[PDB]
Ligand SMILES: [Zn+2]
């Protein structure tokens with residue numbers, strides 16, 4: 145359920161507005177026919193790895209910038 | 214000039230003005246100062262506590278030298294802190310007697326070994342005539358064996374109970390020390406959970422349900438805060454389900470069962486329990502009473518180091534002794550075949566000959582003889598003479614004399630030789646590091662020789678290993694309200710096991726000019 | 727009288743405490759087997775000249791222990807080489823074990839521990855000699871700076887161990903102070919004499935030497 149899940153995601157502890165955003169990322173079929181596989185699609189990970197590489201790259205190559213830390 | 218006038222005061226507090234270094238908040242190395250109880254600058258001196266540290270450095274230099282070297286150290290401190298908590302501790306007559314016995318436990322068990330010599334010296338006089346004991350010295354001495362046998366059994370029983378009040382709380386401590394930490398960090402009972410194997414950990418599932426769980430760790434807070442750190446992760450009250458005269462019923466059951474369940478696992482109690490059961494068997498017959506002379510293997514450090522050598526490399530060894538069994542089985546298969554005729558035990562002639570025609574006994578023939586003979590197998594067999602197999606039988610005998618006695622026994626005798634060169638070099642590296650690298654900062658001697666004398670001061674006036682314990686005495690024995698800001702930084706990080714505060718690289722000299 | 731043998735027997739006493747304790751242990755394990763032997767396997771023991779009349783079963787256990795030491799420690803084959811050989815008894819299944827456990831646990835280990843303790847004594851005494859020479863090759867005995875600082879100059883460190891501290895000259899200087907009038911001292915020598923009286927021993931260079939002090 146869309147409302148019950150908001151209380152259920154505090155177990156996993158992502159913020160609830162964000163959880164509603166995840167439920168929107170889900171097709172949210174019928175009242176709340178939210179398939180778990182329609183949530184594996186977020187694929188996007190290439191970019192997260194690249195962002196990690198970039199932020200790590202800066203963290204290593206430009207140390208002692210408080211803004212960056 | 215002002216301070217030389219002050220010397221009178223500094224000389225008095227010098228013994229117990231302990232001090233250490235920390236990498237405290239500001240990243241620069243602060244040098245905090247802290248009171249040391251004069252009892253603390255004493256208890257850490259005379260006893261096992263000095264040798265226990267010597268076991269420690271040997272248990273790090275030979276095993277650690279890595280990220281755990283700053284973490285096992287406190288793991289040595291929290292144990293050692295607990296030891297003095299014991300000594301501070303050391304029906305009203307009962308505890309007064311029980312403490313009397315627990316403090317005497319090394320002298321007291323040394324008396325037990327003394328009775329083990331005294332009785333067996335009297336066992337020596339036995340002979341069959343019906344077993345019998347001649348008593349040329351007197352007449353009442355045989356009852357003295359009846360009296361010493363009780364007196365030993367008395368010591369055999371009252372030693373374990375003092376062990377129960379001495380080492381055991383420590384053994385129950387460090388078990389809980391290794392548990393309470395894992396609930397608060399690794400989260401394994403809250404998550405990972407050990408499976409079948411590492412059953413010692415699986416046995417530990419039983420204690421955590423208990424309210425009286427953190428009994429020896431001086432932290433009742435443990436379980437209360439595990440749920441704070443882990444209950445938000447997936448479930449609150451479910452973790453609380455995982456946690457939380459009238460004296461007859463007052464004791465908890467599953468804790469105490471777990472406590473004896475850890476105590477049985479301890480080798481030291483299982484040995485003393487084994488040391489005692491035979492003493493109960495020593496009444497039931499005196500020759501079962503002689504097993505106690507094996508205590509000298511544990512009863513003196515001198516022999517223990519020698520016998521330790523044999524088990525130091527013994528896993529390699531027992532496989533080799535077992536390999537010996539197998540290489541002998543290969544000859545006995547070659548012997549049961551081909552050279553079968555040669556085997557004999559022909560008393561007068563033919564009638565009572567004992568050819569080893571059953572290989573199961575033929576295999577037994579070589580181990581009882583060829584492994585033993587020292588001459589090899591051919592020394593106790595019919596000597597070949599005129600047979601075509603004679604050329605071959607020699608090849609069976611030479612190879613067996615080489616491969617078994619000149620090699621495998623040579624390895625077995627020989628693996629013991631290297632065990633003294635491994636155990637020695639381990640003793641060397643301990644000293645070799647201490648003469649060079651500081652145990653803590655890791656800077657090593659050579660930086661600190663630049664100043665006069667030097668490095669010996671850095672190992673005393675500075676880090677001196679010990680004071681980090683006294684400071685951990687000082688923190689645990691101090692109100693949480695009462696901390697100074699440097700100390701609170703330590704104690705806060707100390708709770709988190711971040712362990713940054715131990716100096717690493719930098720010391721107070723490295724930081725400055 | 728000769729240092730040569732003296733080093734060898736000193737090798738022996740170098741680890742000889744552990745050794746005597748190992749022999750004592752040997753006695754104790756042989757006592758344990760003599761106690762297992764005085765029971766159970768008691769019948770096997772014999773010294774039956776012709777038959778029965780002059781048999782010498784070691785029925786007094788003291789003589790039995792004396793038997794395993796005079797014979798079983800020595801036999802080289804273990805205890806079973808000089809006893810009636812089992813051949814029919816059910817104890818024969820056990821007796822071999824009593825042999826095999828004994829032959830391993832005395833002659834194949836304990837004697838091995840002994841000889842090996844001699845071995846580790848030679849390697850230990852040699853390793854000590856090696857540490858002496860090595861500490862002489864590197865660190866100066868006095869200042870402690872070590873060879874490597876002093877190789878920066880040509881040749882070097884051998885000079886620092888001769889032309890400089892050379893160990894001995896501190897002794898000649900301690901001759902020179904003791905063999906010199908207290909009135910006659912120079913301020914340097916008076917200083918060293920005074921501190922020498924007070925056993926403060928700061929005057930020995932430590933770290934710094936004349937080269938460390940200067941450029
Ligand atoms: Zn240090």
Ligand SMILES: [Zn+2]
Nearest residue numbers: 866868869891
């Ligand atoms: Zn020098």
